[PDB]
Amino acid sequence: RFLKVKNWETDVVLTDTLHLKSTLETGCTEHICMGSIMLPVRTKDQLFPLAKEFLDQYYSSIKRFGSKAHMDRLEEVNKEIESTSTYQLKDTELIYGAKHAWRNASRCVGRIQWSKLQVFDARDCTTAHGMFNYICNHVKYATNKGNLRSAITIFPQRTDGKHDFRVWNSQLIRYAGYKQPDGSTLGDPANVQFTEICIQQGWKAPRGRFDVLPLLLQANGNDPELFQIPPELVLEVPIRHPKFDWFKDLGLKWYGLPAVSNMLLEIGGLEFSACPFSGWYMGTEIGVRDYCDNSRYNILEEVAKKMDLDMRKTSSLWKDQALVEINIAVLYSFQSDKVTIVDHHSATESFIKHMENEYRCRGGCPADWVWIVPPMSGSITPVFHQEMLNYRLTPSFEYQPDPWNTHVWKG
Amino acid sequence: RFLKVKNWETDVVLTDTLHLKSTLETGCTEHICMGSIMLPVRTKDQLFPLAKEFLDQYYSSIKRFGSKAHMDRLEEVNKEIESTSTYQLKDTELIYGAKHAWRNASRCVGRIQWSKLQVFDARDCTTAHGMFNYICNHVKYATNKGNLRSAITIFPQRTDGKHDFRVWNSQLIRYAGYKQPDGSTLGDPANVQFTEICIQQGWKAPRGRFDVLPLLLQANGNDPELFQIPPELVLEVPIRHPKFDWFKDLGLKWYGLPAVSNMLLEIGGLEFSACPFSGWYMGTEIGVRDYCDNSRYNILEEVAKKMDLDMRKTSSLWKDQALVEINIAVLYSFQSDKVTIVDHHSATESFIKHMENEYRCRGGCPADWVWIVPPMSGSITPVFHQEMLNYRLTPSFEYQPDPWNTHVW
Ligand code: HEM
Ligand code: HEM
Ligand SMILES: C[C@H](O)[C@H](O)C1=Nc2c(nc(N)[nH]c2=O)NC1
Numbered sequence: 012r013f014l015k016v017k018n019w020e021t022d023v024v025l026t027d028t029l030h031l032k033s034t035l036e037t038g039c040t041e042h043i044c045m046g047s048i049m050l051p052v053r054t055k056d057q058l059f060p061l062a063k064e065f066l067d068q069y070y071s072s073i074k075r076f077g078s079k080a081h082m083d084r085l086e087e088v089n090k091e092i093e094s095t096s097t098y099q100l101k102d103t104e105l106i107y108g109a110k111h112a113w114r115n116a117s118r119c120v121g122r123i124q125w126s127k128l129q130v131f132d133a134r135d136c137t138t139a140h141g142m143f144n145y146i147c148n149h150v151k152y153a154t155n156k157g158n159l160r161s162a163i164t165i166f167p168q169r170t171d172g173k174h175d176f177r178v179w180n181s182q183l184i185r186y187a188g189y190k191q192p193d194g195s196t197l198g199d200p201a202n203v204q205f206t207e208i209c210i211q212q213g214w215k216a217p218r219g220r221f222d223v224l225p226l227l228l229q230a231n232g233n234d235p236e237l238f239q240i241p242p243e244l245v246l247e248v249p250i251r252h253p254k255f256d257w258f259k260d261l262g263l264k265w266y267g268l269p270a271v272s273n274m275l276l277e278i279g280g281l282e283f284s285a286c287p288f289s290g291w292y293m294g295t296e297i298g299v300r301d302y303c304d305n306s307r308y309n310i311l312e313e314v315a316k317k318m319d320l321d322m323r324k325t326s327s328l329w330k331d332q333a334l335v336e337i338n339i340a341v342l343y344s345f346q347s348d349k350v351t352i353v354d355h356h357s358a359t360e361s362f363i364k365h366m367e368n369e370y371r372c373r374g375g376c377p378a379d380w381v382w383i384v385p386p387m388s389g390s391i392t393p394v395f396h397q398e399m400l401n402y403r404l405t406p407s408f409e410y411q412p413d414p415w416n417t418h419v420w421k422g
Numbered sequence: 423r424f425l426k427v428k429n430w431e432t433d434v435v436l437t438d439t440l441h442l443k444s445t446l447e448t449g450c451t452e453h454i455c456m457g458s459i460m461l462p463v464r465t466k467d468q469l470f471p472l473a474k475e476f477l478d479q480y481y482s483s484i485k486r487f488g489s490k491a492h493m494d495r496l497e498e499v500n501k502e503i504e505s506t507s508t509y510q511l512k513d514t515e516l517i518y519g520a521k522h523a524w525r526n527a528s529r530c531v532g533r534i535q536w537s538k539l540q541v542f543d544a545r546d547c548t549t550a551h552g553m554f555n556y557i558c559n560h561v562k563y564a565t566n567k568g569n570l571r572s573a574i575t576i577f578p579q580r581t582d583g584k585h586d587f588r589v590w591n592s593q594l595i596r597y598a599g600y601k602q603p604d605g606s607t608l609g610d611p612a613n614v615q616f617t618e619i620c621i622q623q624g625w626k627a628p629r630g631r632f633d634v635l636p637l638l639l640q641a642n643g644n645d646p647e648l649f650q651i652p653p654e655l656v657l658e659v660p661i662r663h664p665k666f667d668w669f670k671d672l673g674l675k676w677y678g679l680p681a682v683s684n685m686l687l688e689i690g691g692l693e694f695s696a697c698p699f700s701g702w703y704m705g706t707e708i709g710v711r712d713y714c715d716n717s718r719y720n721i722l723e724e725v726a727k728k729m730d731l732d733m734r735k736t737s738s739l740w741k742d743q744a745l746v747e748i749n750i751a752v753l754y755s756f757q758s759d760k761v762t763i764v765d766h767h768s769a770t771e772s773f774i775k776h777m778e779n780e781y782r783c784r785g786g787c788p789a790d791w792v793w794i795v796p797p798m799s800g801s802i803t804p805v806f807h808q809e810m811l812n813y814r815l816t817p818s819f820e821y822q823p824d825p826w827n828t829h830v831w
C-alpha cells in the first residue's frame with residue numbers, strides 16, 4: 012500500500028512505500044495518536060530472524076544479494092548463534108549498521124549527513140579506563156579544533172544483560188546541576204540527579220554554574236568509575252551579542268560538542284548499550300531549549316530586563332523578542348569562534364532536500380514532525396508545512412532506562 | 423487501557439480514560455503515525471446506533487440516564503427513523519451537541535470557552551436569501567462592536583445529499599485573491615480560486631490588496647447565490663506598530679471576526695453541512711500564518727527591509743526578528759481598537775488550565791499537539807511541553823469537500 016505526503020507550501024506530493032518495511036510499533040492505534048508522547052535479553056528463537064533481515068539489507072546495499080558471500084555469511088551467523096547464542100558483526104556490517112541507525116532516526120533533523128559518519132569500533136574494550144580512553148579520542152577527533160566531525164564510538168554489545176557497558180552520563184559533555192537548600196538550582200537543573208550520583212561516587216564538585224561533569228563509565232557490568240575529561244579537550248564558547256555589550260556580562264557559555272551517550276543502538280538484533288555519538292549543534296537547541304526552558308537555565312526574564320522590555324503583559328511579546336536575541340547571540344558567538352553550528356532555517360531547509368531525496372531514492376524517510384520542527388519560529392521554516400510519516404526502521408537508536416535505576420551494585 | 427500524559431516542565435501527570443469512548447479513526451496504526459497529515463448519506467441501520475449513543479450521553483449529562491424520559495426519547499427517535507429515515511433533534515439536544523462538537527475539536531486551543539457558545543437554530547431556513555439574513559445576524563451578534571462573542575448558526579441537516587445547505591466561502595469573511603498578469607498574486611493566494619468562481623459569477627472585484635469577499639450561499643441543494651455583507655457589519659483593523667511609526671505605511675489590515683464556514687457538524691449521526699462558527703483570533707493566526715506564510719501574504723522580506731536588518735544570511739535571524747515585531751503590531755492594533763484578540767502565551771496557558779479541568783471532570787481531553795502548539799515561539803508556550811493524546815469523539819466538526827467539486831449547475 013502506498014502513502015502520500017504533501018507539502019502545503021509547495022504542493023509537492025511524495026509517495027511512501029518504505030513504511031512497508033517497518034515491523035516495529037509506533038505506540039499509536041487506529042483509535043489514538045500518541046505522536047506527542049516523548050517515550051511511547053534476546054533469545055536464539057528471536058535472534059535468527061533479526062540477523063537475517065539485517066544481512067539481507069546489508070548484502071542488497073552492496074549489490075551482492077543472493078551471492079555466495081551473502082549465503083555463506085548467513086550460514087556462518089546462524090551456526091554462531093546456535094553455537095554461542097549470539098554473533099559478532101563484521102567491521103563493514105557495523106559501519107553500515109551505525110550509519111543506517113542514524114539514517115532511520117526519525118527525530119533527527121541533521122540526517123542529510125548520515126553517510127559521512129565516522130565509526131569508531133571499540134568492541135575490544137574491556138574496562139572503564141579503556142572506555143575513558145576511547146571517549147577522549149572520540150571527543151578530540153570530533154571536536155577537530157572547532158571544525159566538528161560527526162562520529163560514534165561503539166562499545167561491546169549486550170550478552171546476558173549482566174555484563175552491560177554503559178555511559179551513565181546523558182551526554183559526554185554537560186554541565187552539573189546543584190539543588191540548593193533554599194530550593195533554587197545552581198547550574199543545569201536537567202543534570203541534578205546525575206550530579207548527585209557523581210558526588211556520591213566521589214566527585215569533588217566545584218559548585219559553579221558551568222562545571223563540566225565527569226564521565227561515569229561502566230564496563231562489563233561492573234560498578235561505574237569516575238574520570239575527568241581533559242579540560243584541553245573540552246571546547247567551550249563564551250556567549251556574546253553582536254549589538255548588546257551587556258550580554259557577555261550574563262556570564263553565559265556552552266560547550267561546542269553535543270554527544271548523546273545514553274541511547275541503545277540496535278543492529279541485526281544485537282544491542283549496543285554504550286554507543287556515544289556526536290554531530291554539531293543547531294542553534295535553537297542551546298538558545299531556545301537549554302537557555303530558555305523554564306526547567307533549564309531559564310534566562311528569559313533577565314535578558315528581557317536588560318533589554319528594558321515591557322514585561323507587564325505577555326501581549327508585548329517580551330518573551331519572544333528576548334528569545335530571538337538570545338538565539339542571535341548563540342549563533343554569533345559560535346561563528347565568531349569558528350565552531351561549527353547551524354541555524355534552524357539552514358538546518359530545516361537541508362532536511363527538506365534530504366527528505367525528498369530519500370523518497371526518490373529510498374521510497375521514503377520516517378520523520379517525527381513534533382521533533383523536527385524547531386522550538387521557535389516553527390512556521391517560517393519549511394518543515395512546518397511538510398507532512399511527515401513516522402515509523403520505526405532498524406537498525407535504530409532506542410531509549411533505555413537510566414542505569415542507576417537498574418544496576419546491581421557489587422560494592 | 424488507562425493512558426498517562428506527562429508535562430515535562432511541571433512533571434504533572436494526568437490519566438486519560440476518555441479516549442476509551444472514542445469511536446472514529448485517527449489515521450494512524452500500530453506501525454505508522456500520520457499525526458502531521460492535514461487530512462487523514464447514512465442508512466437507517468447506520469443511524470440507529472449513533473442516535474442511541476448521543477441520547478445516551480445527552481441524558482447522562484443531565485443526570486437522567488436510564489430514566490423514563492430517556493427511554494421514551496430513544497423509542498420516539500427510534501420510531502421516527504424507521505419512518506422518515508432520520509429524525510429531528512430537540513433544541514436542547516442541538517445546543518448540547520454543538521457545544522460538545524467544539525468541546526471535542528482536538529485542534530482548537532480556545533476550548534476553555536466551550537460551554538458559553540451561543541447557538542442560532544436556523545433549521546427552519548429554506549433559501550439563499552434566508553441564509554444571507556441568518557449570516558448577517560450571526561456576524562453582527564458575534565462582532566458585538568469589538569467585544570466578540572462566540573457563536574454558531576446551524577442550517578438544515580442532510581437528507582438525501584441532493585438537498586444540502588452549504589456556504590461556499592471557507593470563512594464568512596475573507597479577502598479576495600487574484601492572479602495578476604505579473605504572474606504574481608494580488609490579494610490572498612489561498613482564495614485565488616474561490617475568488618475566480620465569484621468574479622465569474624458577476625462579482626465586480628475592486629482588485630485590491632484586502633477586498634472582503636462575497637458570500638456564495640447554497641440552500642436546499644439548489645445552485646449557490648452571491649451577496650455582499652454590509653460593510654458596516656465587517657469590523658476591520660488597521661495594522662500599525664507601537665514603535666515603528668513607519669509600520670502603518672505598509673498598508674495592511676485584517677478583519678476582526680474569524681468564522682470558519684466550510685466544515686460539517688455531526689450530531690447523533692445527523693449531518694449539518696452548513697454550520698458557520700466564530701470565536702476571536704489568537705494573534706499568531708494573522709501575524710505568523712496569514713501575513714508571513716510564503717503562500718499567503720508573504721510579507722517578511724518587505725518588513726525586514728524597512729527594519730534595515732542584515733538579510734544577507736539566515737543566521738542573523740532577520741526573519742525571526744521581523745516575525746516578532748509584526749506579531750507585536752497585530753496584537754497592538756487589535757487591542758488599540760478594542761477588538762477582542764488573545765496572544766499565544768495567554769491562549770496556551772488557558773488551554774493547559776482547560777486540559778486539567780477536562781481531565782479531572784471528564785477523564786481526558788483530545789488534543790492535536792501539531793495544531794495546538796503556536797506557529798512561533800513553540801517551546802516558550804506551556805503546551806509545547808505537554809504530552810497530548812489525539813482521538814475522535816462525537817459530536818464533532820469534520821472536514822468536507824469544497825462544494826464546487828460536488829455541485830452540478
Ligand atoms: C551532524 C549534525 C547533527 C545535527 C545538526 C543533528 C540535529 C538534531 C537535533 C536538532 C535533534 C533534536 C535534539 C533535541 O531536541 O534534544 C536531533 C535528534 C536526534 N539525532 Fe541528530 N543531529 C546530528 C547528528 C546526529 C548523529 C551523528 C546521530 C547518530 C549517529 C544522530 C541521531 C539522533 C537521534 C537518535 C535523535 C533523537 C535523540 C533523542 O531522542 O533524544 N544525530 N538531532
Ligand atoms: C472563541 C475563541 C476561539 C479561539 C481563541 C479559538 C482558537 C483556535 C485556533 C488558534 C485554531 C487553529 C486555526 C488555524 O490554524 O487555522 C482553532 C481551530 C479550530 N477551532 Fe477554535 N477557537 C475559538 C472558537 C471556536 C469555536 C466557537 C469553535 C466551534 C464551535 C471552534 C472549533 C475549532 C475547530 C473544529 C478547529 C480546527 C479547524 C480546522 O481543522 O481547520 N473554535 N481554534
Ligand atoms: C511533550 C512533547 O513531546 C515534548 O515537550 C517535546 N520535546 C521535544 C520536541 N522536539 C525536539 N527537537 N526536542 C524535544 O525535546 N518536541 C516536543
Ligand SMILES: C[C@H](O)[C@H](O)C1=Nc2c(nc(N)[nH]c2=O)NC1
Nearest residue numbers: 395396397398458459460792793
Ligand atoms: C503539514 C502540517 O500538518 C501543517 O503544516 C500544519 N498546519 C497547521 C498546524 N497548526 C495550526 N494551528 N494550523 C495549521 O494550519 N500545524 C501543522
Ligand SMILES: NC(=[NH2+])NCCC[C@H](N)C(=O)O
Nearest residue numbers: 269290291292293296297301
Ligand atoms: N545536534 C545534536 N547532535 N544534538 C544532540 C542533542 C543535544 C541537546 N539537544 C542539547 O541541547 O544539549
Ligand SMILES: NC(=[NH2+])NCCC[C@H](N)C(=O)O
Nearest residue numbers: 680701702703704707708712
Ligand atoms: N480563532 C479562530 N476562531 N480561528 C479560526 C481560523 C482562522 C484562520 N486561522 C485565520 O487566520 O483566518
Ligand SMILES: [Zn+2]
Nearest residue numbers: 039044450455
Ligand atoms: Zn499517530
